[PDB]
Amino acid sequence: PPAIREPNAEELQRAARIIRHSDQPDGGLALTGDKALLFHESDDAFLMYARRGRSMIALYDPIGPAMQRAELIWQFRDLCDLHHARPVFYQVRAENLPFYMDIGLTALKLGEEARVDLLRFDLENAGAAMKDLRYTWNRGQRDGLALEFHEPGQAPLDELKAISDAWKGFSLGRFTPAYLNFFRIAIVRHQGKPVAFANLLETDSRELASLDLMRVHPDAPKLTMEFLMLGLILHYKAQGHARFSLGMVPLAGLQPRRGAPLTQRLGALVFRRGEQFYNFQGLRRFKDKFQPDWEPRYLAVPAGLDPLVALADTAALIAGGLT
């Protein structure tokens, strides 16, 4: 069998095209180039993966049209058997689960993704949740916080490096010019001084927009984070987008429920930090400030086999990274 390689600049450009034609902005993580690309025979859809141990671990569901997604999943199983490796899918949607079942994979709960319904989101709606955001938006504007947007290529990357340094791989983006040049970038300035930034995952449609890197200067005001997020939500709402993703919160960050099946517990082993799980304290509570809708995300592993092995390889690949 041939060699698993990183994609070239021609392949990356082809992948970038596929993402634009999709409703899957999170596919933009393929553009770091540290993930191998499995293109459909039509070159209208791709799947991204990495190898760790005897496992081949795909990142997210395949990027592309519905039918091509399903056929890529079968392609991947074929490719995995050709290399004598076990297929693993990291952070997949429940709707694609039947396809993973068909190639002989079961699943473990990994966490939950928070997405804000932009069409329903309004700061003048009821509830104290909206009240607090109105305060954050005005109090923050008094204090000199301002959100700006830069087309791809723009934005002082030297000023971004300052925040980035004061503040990996596979499931995350990389602070490199080659990568950040692909995306729109939002910057928060405290009375002119850069205090936070974030690259923006978009598509040519307005179905979904999400996040990747989001780094904040440690000396920045407390509200900078909340302000930056709220600003992005209002921004994409105005642009006419339907949903905005705040990212995922792994199991340990959700409300603890023991007495639960191992299927909905074992997924925690992906995020271990020494003698402790990453607890992701307040991460759920923070995302909940914007009243998002939560949806499960799964880790697809070979069925009828001890998932501890695939969990180990997945844990190693992730190396503790999250948005």
Please give the residue ranges that form the binding site for Cl ion (CB under 5 A).
26, 221-222
- CA atoms 262, 263, 268, 274: torsion sign: positive
CA–CA gap between residue 194 and residue 223 (Å, rounded): 14
Cα distances (angstroms) measured from residue 188 to each of 27, 65, 80, 145, 199: 25, 35, 44, 7, 12
Looking at beta carbons only, is 221 or 267 nearer to Cl ion? 221
Looking at beta carbons only, is 139 or 222 nearer to Cl ion? 222
CA 58, 30, 154: angle at the middle one, nearest 5?
160
Q: Are 265 and 221 in contact (CB under 8 A)?
A: no
Minimum separation from the CB atom of position 122 to Cl ion (A): 25
In this chain, which residue has its C-beta nearest to Cl ion?
221
Q: Can you tell me which residue has the tokens 């039947």?
A: 98
Looking at beta carbons only, is 53 or 296 nearer to Cl ion? 296
Minimum separation from the CB atom of position 70 to Cl ion (A): 11
97: Cβ contacts below 8 Å, ≥ 6 apart: 107, 298, 300
Looking at beta carbons only, is 184 or 297 nearer to Cl ion? 297
Cα distances (angstroms) measured from residue 279 to each of 268, 275, 286, 308: 9, 12, 14, 20
CA–CA gap between residue 261 and residue 270 (Å, rounded): 17
Looking at beta carbons only, is 23 or 288 nearer to Cl ion? 23
Minimum separation from the CB atom of position 82 to Cl ion (A): 26
Minimum separation from the CB atom of position 248 to Cl ion (A): 7
Nearest CA among 136, 51, 111 for reference residue 323: 111
Minimum separation from the CB atom of position 242 to Cl ion (A): 14
Looking at beta carbons only, is 70 or 155 nearer to Cl ion? 70
Minimum separation from the CB atom of position 304 to Cl ion (A): 26
CA–CA gap between residue 251 and residue 232 (Å, rounded): 26
